[PDB]
Motif scaffolding. Sequence first.
Motif, PDB file in Angstrom:
ATOM      1  N   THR A   8       5.577  12.160  -9.051  1.00  0.00           N
ATOM      2  CA  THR A   8       4.224  12.696  -8.940  1.00  0.00           C
ATOM      3  C   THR A   8       3.957  13.814  -9.941  1.00  0.00           C
ATOM      4  OG1 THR A   8       5.075  14.014  -7.094  1.00  0.00           O
ATOM      5  CG2 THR A   8       3.782  12.054  -6.560  1.00  0.00           C
ATOM      6  N   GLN A  24       4.630   3.143  -5.460  1.00  0.00           N
ATOM      7  CA  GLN A  24       4.125   3.899  -4.311  1.00  0.00           C
ATOM      8  C   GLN A  24       4.701   5.311  -4.395  1.00  0.00           C
ATOM      9  OE1 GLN A  24       5.646   1.421  -1.232  1.00  0.00           O
ATOM     10  NE2 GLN A  24       3.992  -0.088  -1.369  1.00  0.00           N
ATOM     11  N   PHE A  26       3.093   7.925  -3.027  1.00  0.00           N
ATOM     12  CA  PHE A  26       2.634   8.671  -1.867  1.00  0.00           C
ATOM     13  C   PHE A  26       2.290   7.691  -0.757  1.00  0.00           C
ATOM     14  CE2 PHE A  26      -1.259   7.687  -4.108  1.00  0.00           C
ATOM     15  CZ  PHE A  26      -2.132   7.345  -3.097  1.00  0.00           C
ATOM     16  N   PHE A  27       2.163   8.224   0.453  1.00  0.00           N
ATOM     17  CA  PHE A  27       1.724   7.457   1.608  1.00  0.00           C
ATOM     18  C   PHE A  27       0.305   7.876   1.968  1.00  0.00           C
ATOM     19  CE2 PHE A  27       1.273   7.079   6.262  1.00  0.00           C
ATOM     20  CZ  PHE A  27       1.357   5.707   6.365  1.00  0.00           C
ATOM     21  N   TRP A  28      -0.563   6.892   2.188  1.00  0.00           N
ATOM     22  CA  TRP A  28      -1.967   7.159   2.478  1.00  0.00           C
ATOM     23  C   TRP A  28      -2.162   7.241   3.985  1.00  0.00           C
ATOM     24  CZ3 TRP A  28      -6.520   3.196   1.956  1.00  0.00           C
ATOM     25  CH2 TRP A  28      -7.716   3.852   2.268  1.00  0.00           C
ATOM     26  N   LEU A  29      -2.618   8.395   4.460  1.00  0.00           N
ATOM     27  CA  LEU A  29      -3.011   8.564   5.855  1.00  0.00           C
ATOM     28  C   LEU A  29      -4.458   8.106   5.983  1.00  0.00           C
ATOM     29  CD1 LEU A  29      -2.314   9.615   8.696  1.00  0.00           C
ATOM     30  CD2 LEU A  29      -3.050  11.874   7.930  1.00  0.00           C
ATOM     31  N   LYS A  30      -4.669   6.976   6.658  1.00  0.00           N
ATOM     32  CA  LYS A  30      -5.952   6.287   6.573  1.00  0.00           C
ATOM     33  C   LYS A  30      -7.030   6.919   7.443  1.00  0.00           C
ATOM     34  CE  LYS A  30      -4.848   1.642   4.969  1.00  0.00           C
ATOM     35  NZ  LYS A  30      -5.081   0.192   5.207  1.00  0.00           N
ATOM     36  N   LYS A  31      -6.678   7.851   8.324  1.00  0.00           N
ATOM     37  CA  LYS A  31      -7.674   8.539   9.144  1.00  0.00           C
ATOM     38  C   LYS A  31      -8.241   9.691   8.326  1.00  0.00           C
ATOM     39  CE  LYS A  31      -7.686  10.833  13.590  1.00  0.00           C
ATOM     40  NZ  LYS A  31      -7.435  10.446  15.005  1.00  0.00           N
ATOM     41  N   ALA A  32      -9.522   9.594   7.975  1.00  0.00           N
ATOM     42  CA  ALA A  32     -10.137  10.584   7.103  1.00  0.00           C
ATOM     43  C   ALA A  32     -10.562  11.819   7.890  1.00  0.00           C
ATOM     44  CB  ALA A  32     -11.346   9.981   6.389  1.00  0.00           C
TER      45      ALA A  32
ATOM     46  N   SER B  45      10.212   3.013  -4.384  1.00  0.00           N
ATOM     47  CA  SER B  45       9.203   2.075  -3.900  1.00  0.00           C
ATOM     48  C   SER B  45       9.835   0.764  -3.451  1.00  0.00           C
ATOM     49  CB  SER B  45       8.163   1.817  -4.989  1.00  0.00           C
ATOM     50  OG  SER B  45       7.589   3.028  -5.443  1.00  0.00           O
TER      51      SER B  45
END
Lengths: 51, 50
Positions: A8, A24, A26-32, B45
Amino acid sequence: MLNYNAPTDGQKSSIDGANSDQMQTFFWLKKAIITARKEQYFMPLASVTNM
Amino acid sequence: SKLPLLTENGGRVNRVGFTRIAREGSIHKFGFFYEFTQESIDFDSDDGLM
């Protein structure tokens, strides 16, 4: 040594060459995060006369 | 001119010798390796990297 390094920050892992990168990073936290509607204090005070 | 001709009286004539050769071969040692950290596996990954 095969190091993960810091993809990153532009520090590629040892396994990735000039034409490769981590798929990948990062991990996407889908709750905005959202804000609520502002409160109303004067609208409830209004009486209605039909037009 | 070199046939082993033998006369009627024999004698010490037409003596020969023999020869042998020795072959040999050896073995040698080979090897190589690679290293890796735990982070290079867990945070990568692709989970099939190893």
